[PDB]
């Protein structure tokens, strides 16, 4: 019995899968082609676990999950026995996304909850949490993705149909908003920064209004460029939108039971692939 | 509701309630469709053809010499497949010819090389059009037309023979000139054609065609074979230009270009594309870019191989950015095919050192395990993968699988925590001395063995879980051994129970 899992994540080396469902449990699997043997079940949430996310193995085996009970729970495998080492629930509503930073930033976490907040939880020398939070969106935040870089930044998708690009500032010590972008007529479900250290940067912003805008910024200066992936509404509301590391391929999880795939061509415009 | 993101090992997980986990491990459909690529022998022999040098802005490998030729791939393909035709024709036009015999001076050499290339190209075209024309000869009901068709197969002698046999003797004589570029005959033939085409009550339809061939400009003309556009493969007519056409005064390229200027080729036809890229000479890249946005006849792999050959043979010129674009694309296709060694190898052909560094590093660290199996995987990490990168990556894989020699080459304290035998401690101390946190060093120095300093160090370390308690217990035992007194009592002034037992 597992009729509705909400999120799954793969570890750096892809040996250990972590699915999370609505019955509150987080199941860990040892994958091997066909056969994923169930190795664990983790019960510590008071509502459907929306998302899970491993951290960089540089920090051992850590997995931050966020669930409907408004609480972010950090887990850790310890000699082959899992244990909830920390928790971070400074958010008064259902926590939606949770995504670790690039491992060069430390062990930073990115939480994004419906109380219009988004936190960056550092884990200090005592391993204790060092929360520095910001207000992100009015009617709630559905998602928040990190950006790689070599001047740190992330993106957030809102319930006011916004897509925001925040940047760290030593003057403020809190991430200062640097640019907001408007293009959807309904709750911005997911936002994704692309890991392509190439000539430009790409953002795929899926939404409830069955659109997927692509914000391609030329460089560090010239603002983004709006590009409705295709100019027809998808047969059903879209949920997830993920970039590929090698290649800059885009995967779109529409509520139409297939996942589409879109690649950029020399027109600059985007074309299906599969 | 659905969810799907991309894996580290770029592949896709989606909701799937037919499986056991509630997700599906999908092998991302690879565009990379070319069999020999999944065979590691090809890759080994392909690395044998390369000279790898470290960059002048970082230690990461990038290619200094390549001896790759379109020629080389041909062994791994069927001589029957259209692909083989593409690669072969590409070899004929682009791979350097060698002329083994010594030549009085070097411009003669150049000339001979031109003749050789020309002869191979035209033999090949005749190979292709062969059955087409032979079919046409099968169905002809007229001898002079057959003679013409034999000229279409660049068989001057059989044409001459049929002429002889069909009682067309003068024609026969004329034919024997085909393929000598005698400008006298050229202008005479053209003259005869004008005289006919000014009065000339009637001349046989195919005799005029043959004269037009002798004219050296069979479409370029005023009695033009251009209308044969509708009766013959474009390649067949191109054969006509290449064989007769005016070989000596023109270069192979500008000749082919001359022909192409008279006839649009189908956008989708790739042997067409190759001729266009060959003829385009002065701006191959320009055309290549045009070809890119117009068609997919040239695949990712081919475009990369092409660009690389031409680059490393001086044959032609491509932007650092276009060569890198091609290279990225192919390396990516390869990585989507779980062909990491091969993707890595390709990744090395990057000009942008920054990008090469990132790509290479990222991939090696993410995928180190698979990249350390056979000797064909060894030569791989003996591309010139930086010692640092290889071991560093290997360090990460150990921390995650629950290393030390790597770290030796915060985190160190965590390793020391994991470690808590004497010989190993000594070796670690030696490594630390070679490298030269301080508190741990003091503790180690004490363990190898002033007492008060060691005590203060241990206390400081305690201020900074099972391992630590064990170390504390060991220190306690040592102190107890030392007391066996007043100084020891002065220094002192389950853990609680032990402390009580001590007092």
From Swiss-Prot, chain A:
This protein's record includes keyword Transferase: no
Record annotation: effect of changing residue 247 to D: Growth inhibited above 34 degrees Celsius
Cell compartments where the protein resides: Cytoplasmic vesicle, COPII-coated vesicle membrane; Endoplasmic reticulum membrane; Nucleus, Nuclear pore complex; Vacuole membrane
InterPro entries recorded: Sec13/Seh1_fam (IPR037363), WD40/YVTN_repeat-like_dom_sf (IPR015943), WD40_repeat_dom_sf (IPR036322), WD40_rpt (IPR001680)
Listed result of changing residue 243 to R: Growth inhibited above 30 degrees Celsius
Keywords assigned: Cytoplasmic vesicle, Endoplasmic reticulum, ER-Golgi transport, Membrane, mRNA transport, Nuclear pore complex, Nucleus, Protein transport, Repeat, Translocation, Transport, Vacuole, WD repeat
Gene Ontology terms describing biological process: COPII-coated vesicle budding; ERAD pathway; mRNA transport; nuclear pore localization; nucleocytoplasmic transport; positive regulation of DNA-templated transcription; positive regulation of ER to Golgi vesicle-mediated transport; positive regulation of protein exit from endoplasmic reticulum
Molecular function GO labels: structural molecule activity
PROSITE patterns: WD_REPEATS_2, WD_REPEATS_REGION
Subunit (UniProt): The basic repeat unit of a COPII coated vesicle is composed of 5 proteins: the small GTPase SAR1, the heterodimeric SEC23-SEC24 complex, and the heterotetrameric SEC13-SEC31 complex. This repeat unit polymerizes to induce membrane deformation into a transport vesicle. Component of the nuclear pore complex (NPC). NPC constitutes the exclusive means of nucleocytoplasmic transport.
Function field: Functions as a component of the nuclear pore complex (NPC) and the COPII coat. It is one of 5 proteins constituting the COPII coat, which is involved in anterograde (ER to Golgi) double-membrane transport vesicle formation. First the small GTPase SAR1, activated by and binding to the integral ER membrane protein SEC12, exchanges GDP for GTP and recruits the heterodimer SEC23/24, which in turn recruits the heterotetramer SEC13-SEC31. The polymerization of COPII coat complexes then causes physically the deformation (budding) of the membrane, leading to the creation of a transport vesicle.
Family membership noted in the UniProt record: Belongs to the WD repeat SEC13 family.
Misc. comment: Present with 21400 molecules/cell in log phase SD medium.
Protein name, as recorded: Protein transport protein SEC13
Organism listed in the record: Saccharomyces cerevisiae (strain ATCC 204508 / S288c) (Baker's yeast)
From Swiss-Prot, chain B:
Leader sequence segment: none
Membrane topology, record value: Peripheral membrane protein
Localization per Swiss-Prot or TrEMBL: Nucleus, Nuclear pore complex; Nucleus membrane
Protein name: Nucleoporin NUP145C
Organism of derivation: Saccharomyces cerevisiae (strain ATCC 204508 / S288c) (Baker's yeast)
Gene behind the chain: NUP145
Span of the entire protein shown here: 754 to 1317 of 1317
């Amino acid at each position: 019995h597992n009729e509705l899992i909400h999120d799954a994540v793969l570890d750096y080396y892809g040996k250990r899968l972590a699915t999370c469902s609505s019955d509150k449990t987080i199941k860990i699997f040892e994958v091997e082609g066909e056969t994923h043997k169930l190795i664990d079940t983790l019960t510590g949430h008071e509502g459907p676990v929306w998302r899970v996310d491993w951290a960089h193995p540089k920090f051992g085996t850590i997995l931050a999950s966020c669930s409907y009970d408004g609480k972010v729970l950090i887990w850790k495998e310890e000699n082959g026995r899992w244990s909830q080492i920390a928790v971070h629930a400074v958010h008064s509503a259902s926590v939606n996304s949770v995504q670790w930073a690039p491992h060069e930033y430390g062990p930073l976490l990115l939480v994004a909850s419906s109380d219009g907040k988004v936190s960056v939880v550092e884990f200090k020398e005592n391993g204790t949490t060092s929360p520095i939070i910001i207000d992100a969106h009015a009617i709630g935040v559905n998602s928040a993705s990190w950006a790689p870089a070599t001047s740190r930044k992330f993106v957030t998708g809102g319930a006011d149909n916004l897509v925001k690009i925040w940047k760290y500032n030593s003057d403020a010590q809190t991430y200062v908003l640097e640019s907001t972008l408007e293009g959807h007529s309904d709750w911005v479900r997911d936002v994704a920064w692309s890991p392509t250290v190439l000539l430009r940067s790409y953002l795929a912003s899926v939404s409830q209004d069955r659109t997927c805008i692509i914000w391609t910024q030329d460089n560090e200066q010239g603002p983004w460029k709006k590009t409705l992936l295709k100019e027809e509404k998808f047969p059903d509301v879209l949920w997830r939108a993920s970039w590929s590391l090698s290649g800059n391929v885009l995967a779109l999880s529409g509520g139409d039971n297939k996942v589409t795939l879109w690649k950029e061509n020399l027109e600059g415009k985007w074309e299906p692939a599969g | 509701y659905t969810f799907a993101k991309f894996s580290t090992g770029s592949m896709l997980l989606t909701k799937d309630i037919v499986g056991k986990s509630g997700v599906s491990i999908k092998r991302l459909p690879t565009e990379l469709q070319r069999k020999f690529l999944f065979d590691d022998v090809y890759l080994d022999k392909e690395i044998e053809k390369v000279t790898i040098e470290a960059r002048k802005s970082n230690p990461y490998p990038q290619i200094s010499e390549s001896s790759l030729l379109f020629k080389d791939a041909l062994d791994y393909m069927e001589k029957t497949s259209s692909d083989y035709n593409l690669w072969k024709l590409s070899s004929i036009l682009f791979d350097p010819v060698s002329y083994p015999y010594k030549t009085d001076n070097d411009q003669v050499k150049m000339a001979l090389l031109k003749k050789e290339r020309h002869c191979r190209l035209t033999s090949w075209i005749v190979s292709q059009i062969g059955p087409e024309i032979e079919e046409k000869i099968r169905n002809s009901s007229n001898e002079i037309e057959q003679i013409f068709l034999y000229l279409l197969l660049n068989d001057v002698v059989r044409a001459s023979k049929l002429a002889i046999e069909s009682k067309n003797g003068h024609l026969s004589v004329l034919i024997s000139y085909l393929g000598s570029n005698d400008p006298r005959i050229r202008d005479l033939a053209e003259l005869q054609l004008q005289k006919w085409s000014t009065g000339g009550c009637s001349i046989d339809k195919n005799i005029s065609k043959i004269y037009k061939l002798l004219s050296g400009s069979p479409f370029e003309g005023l009695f033009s074979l251009k209308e044969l556009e509708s009766e013959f493969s474009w390649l067949c007519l191109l054969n006509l230009t290449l064989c007769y056409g005016q070989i000596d005064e023109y270069s192979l390229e500008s000749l082919v270009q001359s022909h192409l200027d008279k006839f649009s080729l189908p956008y989708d036809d790739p042997i067409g594309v190759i001729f266009q890229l060959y003829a385009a000479n002065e701006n191959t890249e320009k055309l290549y870019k045009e070809v890119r946005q117009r068609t997919n006849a040239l695949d990712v792999q081919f475009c990369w191989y092409l660009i690389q050959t031409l680059r490393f043979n001086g044959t032609r010129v491509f932007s650092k950015e276009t060569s890198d674009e091609a290279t990225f694309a192919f390396a990516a296709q390869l990585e989507f095919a779980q062909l990491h060694g091969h993707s890595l190898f390709v990744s090395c052909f990057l000009n942008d050192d920054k990008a090469a560094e990132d790509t290479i590093k990222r991939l090696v660290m993410r995928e180190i395990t698979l990249l350390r199996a056979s000797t064909n995987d060894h030569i791989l990490n003996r591309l010139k993968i930086p010692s640092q990168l290889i071991f560093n990556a290997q360090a990460l894989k150990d921390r995650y699988e629950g290393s030390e020699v790597q770290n030796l080459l915060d985190l160190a304290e965590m390793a020391i925590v994991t470690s808590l035998v004497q010989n190993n401690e000594l070796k670690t101390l030696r490594e630390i001395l070679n490298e030269f946190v301080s508190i741990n060093v003091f503790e180690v120095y004490l363990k190898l063995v002033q007492e008060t300093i060691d005590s203060l160090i241990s206390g400081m370390k305690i201020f900074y879980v099972a391992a630590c308690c064990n170390v504390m217990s060991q220190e306690i035992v040592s102190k107890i051994l030392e007391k066996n007194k007043a100084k020891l009592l002065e220094l002192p002034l389950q853990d609680l129970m032990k402390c009580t037992y001590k007092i």
